[PDB]
Design a protein around this ligand. Structure first.
Ligand SMILES: Cc1cn([C@H]2C[C@H](O)[C@@H](COP(=O)(O)OP(=O)(O)OP(=O)(O)O)O2)c(=O)[nH]c1=O
Ligand SMILES: Cc1cn([C@H]2C[C@H](O)[C@@H](COP(=O)(O)OP(=O)(O)OP(=O)(O)O)O2)c(=O)[nH]c1=O
Ligand SMILES: [Mg+2]
Ligand SMILES: [Mg+2]
Ligand SMILES: [Zn+2]
Lengths: 474, 412, 496
DNA sequence: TTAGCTGGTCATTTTTTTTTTTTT
RNA sequence: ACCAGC
């Protein structure tokens, strides 16, 4: 903080390093020395300019703390002053690694060290671009940690191409391999290392097994209620966002709940619901009543009857015996809870409902960022994701609930919903027409099969709640 | 691990009840630190606060070991009476609190406790020094597996049930194993019959072979328990006084005198052997009113294998002559009982047939896979003990006794 | 650590004194041992005494080993606790008294803990939110097991626990005792146990301290958030099984709506001035004093006294605001309070006097007064006119959710472009709700009123159900005839 | 003139490009 | 000084 500490006023002395394995000759050559001030022996590193002017000190104590002597520059490199040329340099992460490489090479190769570490390595490598132009090969030598991989990935972007090569180590870094006696395996990594391949691009031939693995995987889940839908959809696979829409109160939640029950009690798939329209008890009673082919909430006398004769447990054990269902209790925390539902529990189908409250500033950027995050969550996971949405107000003509055929550009809020959803299914019925229990399924978008239009017809039952495959001809 | 954590969580909520109930009875007081005072409360762990609270409760100790303080132990807190009938019930709670405090200090909260020396495979490795005592007796440390409380002590069966051999499932079948424990009965008392057989012409070791010695000693000495009789005979044998063996029966020095005169006139060969040992070792002993000046002639004693056994005190020569000759036969027997099993065609180790687990001064504890292996071990132990008795040409007949069980609560 | 025994000098014994590797000796007989403010308070200056706490119960040795000492400065009693570092120096202090005067002296860091200056290696650790419970666990465990405590409380656990990561990383299992939730710690390692009392001090002072120690060594798993499995719905559904409020005025409504439930949004609409307030006022008057339910009204069109006069004139089957002599006669003979008392003896009606300030008042009316049916009128003053109404409908749907309240909302209609107007008898559609298009998306029941004031019958109305999630029966419910002399509209039997 | 042989204990407000869903 | 063993 005060000033550059002179070795005369701080009792400087050049010694060896027994605990790390460095003799006094290397620390004499570099300038890493030891001060005796305030009783406690302080370790201190010296920084120099291109000419040799002392500009900065790095003071560290016995208990792993940091102390800067003043203005720490961005072009501060430990070891830059000693070398002014060469064909092969080695850039070390810390400061003991550079001394270790100087110990194992008898002061031959130009080896330097960083001045910031792995936190601000990109700034000090962008500010030292003019120094690396006079060289021919650069060997990056960082830690075998996740932060070390992040540093060797992101700090190798502001470097000149064709001259960067990355070596690997079995230890944390080179110093423990010097302590464990791996002095022969490090010299081969100095001489022959691996080039700047693993950035993220792949080769055309390295996928040959993995495409086979995906060839041996990815079976679609068959829908229920209609066989004409599966003839142009072929199920639902991993990474499949299926959008469901209709008019206001036309049977979205009923069809989705029936699809969830038919996937639960007949396939054994672990299904995670996130119903936000109603709470847990109402949808639980709806599932229990729908499995027993009755309307549970629509009969107070039946609810009074089934609790007296003790047959409620007979319906509870046949449903929740295997615990295949996992419900949710009512913005970025929902993504983490769905991530825990997928990874921590192990579900295969995730169902949401009523996305308009979730997007409730500018709603378009919010719903676009939300759809991007759900698409990225569905990507590289292998999960069916069912999303329920609503429609907007038409300008002229009749209403959507009165049996009007709906188009694909009627999804409210933005246009980004149809640009990322794979299969969009719309439901159509007329409650004021002749038959208010005959529905129409319309495939608006299908990325995989490509067959759009009217799928089939189903007939709703007002007594049991089980809509059946009808045989109506339009 | 689980069975001892259950015991620890059981008897940790007991001493937290014995302090709330007790400090309201024995109240706090001021202690002198213008006169500085402090409000100090009753500490039942200290032996100084209980002495002060029994002074002001109307009790006279009538026993002064120290020059200014009475003695406080288990035998003075039983025969104690006060006027307040609440303190008479509170003294039993104080003794129970001290017992639970020692249990806690030994079991889990100690620096050398049980739970701080458990390996990753659920086992305990203890240091066993083969020659630590001055009489050739092996010692045990880090931790000490030869000093846990027995089955007669409170919370004794619940501790020895955890130190079992059935907690090691086999790595090929997934089955627990069987523990065999083999103890010698009447070791030093039969070695004494071996030594002094040249004085009474050897008609003393015949009664020892004729039934149990401690049972008929209990009958002829009217002791209530066999353990008190076994304590009394080895107290009387290894140079007691007039009151320390009257303390075993609880009576005065007159009964302690008449029992010594009774057991001395039965077999007049103990005093002759003692006089022979004193004529062998010492030659002169000057007497001091506050010390003792002894001019030695032979400090060491030749043992059963020519080993120079060291003598510390001249009136304890019978002790270092008896127990030093009694450990070597067990040390040879524990060698021979595996030298027969290896030559028989068995395999030692956890991946084999048997494994030694614990060797205290008298008994051995072996763990084996099947009960037939335990039958072979309990058969060959008698043959090994017979070879021990035959190899050094003993005048007596050595005998052991073994037990078979799941753990080390039945096979004690 | 113990090495061997030496002969003592005070007691003069032979094997009473014991020597240690640290250089100190100890005799077992003679018991002799050898060898803001921004100011840290000195111990001896402020009269530091290690007094044992009496009213709750903490021994003196725990206060000595923890650093919780009593100051007698200025004639009062302070309880100073000390926070240290890894080096073994006093970093900060905390002062607590009978009035809980939080005077935190010294450099109080954001990652300050208590009891970390002695413990670096181990297996288990117990983290509490206070200091008395931490010392209570030290009393129960005799000050030998690793127990730390937060220095800032359970309100800022996202800062203190997040800054200390490598200290908690050195152990194998971390047990929490906060409330009877911080996920910055690594997963698969943290256990949370539940006590049957408020904290550990109540189990200590009420004899349940065994249930402390049974939960320490046998704590339960993490269980992050409200992800509820299907097994935990055994008694909640059975409690939920053990109700539709009847719509008074017409019997054709209840044949296809089956009443309203807990958390039910009802929307009432008609044309411009077709009598929404009269119909909703009649339902409120027939539901409040005739069914025993507490109803909260929020009539924003008129004042409190005017709707009180309406209610009083309605219940007595007269027209109060349509005659001055009828208002004058009822006060000159003392029959005014007779209408007051027989209607307001039960106090089931609660009126409102006149946008986020409304939701707090509705929460105070629902939770505080304990009502069941809340009625809102004249939404136009409350509500760009698309984001505000959508946020308002979302907040009211969230308020009606998980509460058990029937929320009635009166809305309006938009102006038509072609054809006949709504005042001439036009059949209204579902997409005529002005303001937004989400009003028909969150409402669970939609009721429309249709009448023609210029036709043949200017007092015949029609009820149209537009949306019903419970059954699915929409359309014309029936006909009712309005009274121009009493105000009470009656169910008729008109046919088309 | 003396039962012994072990182990273990506690202590210090300004301007301009893109999108959407109502209404005048 | 106390506790436990062998
Ligand atoms: C398809 C269909 C549904 N119904 C009933 C049963 C359904 O529970 C009810 C509507 O309930 P939902 O199925 O929940 O309606 P929705 O999901 O399409 O939209 P929202 O919840 O946002 O209003 O309509 C019929 O009466 N006849 C029919 O043909
Ligand atoms: C109890 C005790 C035993 N011993 C000796 C006696 C034995 O030689 C050895 C162990 O004694 P024990 O095994 O207790 O007695 P025991 O072997 O004669 O009889 P049993 O097996 O049938 O129960 O240690 C003492 O020296 N001092 C003692 O206080
Ligand atoms: Mg729905
Ligand atoms: Mg024996
Ligand atoms: Zn002393």
């Amino acid at each position: 903080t005060y000033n550059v500490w002179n070795f005369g006023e701080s009792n400087g002395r050049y010694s060896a390093l027994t605990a790390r394995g460095i003799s006094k000759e290397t620390c004499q050559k570099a300038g890493y020395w030891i001060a005796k001030v305030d009783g406690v022996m302080y370790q201190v590193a010296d920084y120099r300019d291109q000419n040799g002017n002392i500009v900065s000190q790095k003071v560290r104590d016995k208990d792993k703390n940091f102390k800067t002597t003043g203005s720490h520059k961005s072009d501060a490199l430990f070891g830059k002053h000693l070398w002014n040329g060469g064909k092969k340099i080695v850039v070390t992460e810390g400061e003991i690694d550079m001394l270790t490489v100087m110990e194992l090479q008898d002061c031959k190769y130009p080896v330097v060290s960083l001045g910031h570490g792995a936190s601000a390595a990109k700034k000090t490598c962008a500010a030292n671009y003019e120094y690396f132009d006079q060289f021919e090969q650069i060997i990056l030598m960082f830690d075998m940690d996740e932060a070390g991989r992040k540093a060797v990935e992101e700090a190798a972007q502001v470097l000149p191409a064709g001259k960067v090569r990355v070596a690997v180590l079995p230890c944390k870094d080179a110093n423990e391999c010097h302590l464990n006696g791996h002095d022969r395996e490090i010299m081969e990594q100095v001489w022959n290392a691996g080039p700047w391949i693993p950035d993220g691009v792949v080769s055309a031939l390295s996928l040959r097994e993995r495409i086979r693995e995906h060839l041996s995987s990815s079976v679609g889940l068959l829908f229920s209620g209609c066989t004409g839908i599966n003839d142009k959809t072929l199920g639902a696979r991993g990474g499949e966002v299926i959008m469901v829409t209709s008019g206001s109160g036309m049977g979205k939640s009923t069809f989705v709940r029936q699809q969830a029950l038919q996937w639960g009690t007949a396939m054994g798939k672990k299904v995670g619901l996130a119903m936000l329209q109603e709470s847990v008890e109402e949808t639980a009673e709806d599932l229990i009543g729908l499995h027993n082919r009755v309307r549970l909430r629509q009969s107070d006398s039946l609810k009074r009857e089934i609790i007296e004769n003790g047959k409620f447990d007979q319906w509870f054990d046949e449903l929740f015996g295997n615990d295949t269902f996992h419900l949710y209790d009512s913005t970025d925390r929902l993504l983490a809870k769905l991530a825990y539902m997928r990874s921590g529990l192990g579900c295969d189908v995730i169902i949401l409902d009523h996305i308009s409250i979730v997007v409730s500033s500018d709603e378009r950027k919010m719903i676009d960022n939300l759809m991007t995050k759900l698409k990225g969550f569905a990507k590289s996971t292998g999960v069916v994701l069912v999303v329920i949405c609503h429609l907007k107000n038409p300008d002229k003509g009749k209403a959507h609930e009165e049996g009007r055929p709906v188009s694909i550009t009627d999804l409210r809020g933005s246009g980004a919903l149809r640009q990322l959803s794979d299969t969009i299914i719309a439901l159509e019925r007329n409650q004021q027409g002749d038959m208010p229990n005959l529905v129409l399924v319309r495939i608006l978008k299908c990325r995989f099969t490509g067959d759009t239009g009217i799928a089939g017809y189903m007939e709703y039952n007002k007594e049991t709640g089980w809509l059946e495959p009808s045989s109506y001809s339009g | 691990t689980k069975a001892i954590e259950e015991l620890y969580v059981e008897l940790a909520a007991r001493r937290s009840e014995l302090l709330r109930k007790l400090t309201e009875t024995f109240g706090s007081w001021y202690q002198p630190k213008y006169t500085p005072v402090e409000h100090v409360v009753f500490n039942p762990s200290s032996r100084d606060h209980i002495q002060k609270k029994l002074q002001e409760a109307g009790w006279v100790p009538t026993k002064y070991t120290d020059k200014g303080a009475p003695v406080v132990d288990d035998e003075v807190l039983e025969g104690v009476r006060v006027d307040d009938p609440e303190k008479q019930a509170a003294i039993d709670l104080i003794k129970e609190y001290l017992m639970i405090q020692k249990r806690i200090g030994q079991s889990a909260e100690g620096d050398k406790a049980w739970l701080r020396y458990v390996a990753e495979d659920g086992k305990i490795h203890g240091s066993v020094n083969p020659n630590g005592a001055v009489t050739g007796r092996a010692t045990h440390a880090f931790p000490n597996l030869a000093q846990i409380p027995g089955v007669r002590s409170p919370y004794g069966e619940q501790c020895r049930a955890a130190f079992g051999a059935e907690h090691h499932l086999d790595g090929i079948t997934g089955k627990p194993w069987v523990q065999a424990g083999i103890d010698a009965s009447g070791l030093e008392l039969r070695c004494l019959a071996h030594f002094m057989a040249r004085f009474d012409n050897g008609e003393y070791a015949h009664e020892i072979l004729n039934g149990d010695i401690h049972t008929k000693n209990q009958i002829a000495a009217e002791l209530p328990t066999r353990d008190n009789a076994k304590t009394f005979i080895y107290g009387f044998l290894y140079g007691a006084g007039d009151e320390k063996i009257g303390q075993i029966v609880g009576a005065g020095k007159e009964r302690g005198k008449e029992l010594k005169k009774k057991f001395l006139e039965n077999t007049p060969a103990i005093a002759a052997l003692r006089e022979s040992i004193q004529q062998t070792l010492v030659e002169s002993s000057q007497w001091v009113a506050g010390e003792q000046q002894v001019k030695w002639k032979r400090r060491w004693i030749k043992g059963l294998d020519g080993r120079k056994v060291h003598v510390r005190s001249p009136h304890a020569a019978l002790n270092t002559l008896l127990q030093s000759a009694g450990a070597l036969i067990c040390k040879l027997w524990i060698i021979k009982t595996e030298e027969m099993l290896v030559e028989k065609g068995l395999k030692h180790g956890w991946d084999g047939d048997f494994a030694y687990m614990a060797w205290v001064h008298d008994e051995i504890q072996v763990g084996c896979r099947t009960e037939e292996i335990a039958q072979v071990v309990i058969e060959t132990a008698q043959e090994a003990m017979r070879w021990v008795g035959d190899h050094w040409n003993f005048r007596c007949l050595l005998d052991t006794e073994g037990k078979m069980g799941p753990n080390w609560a039945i096979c004690h």
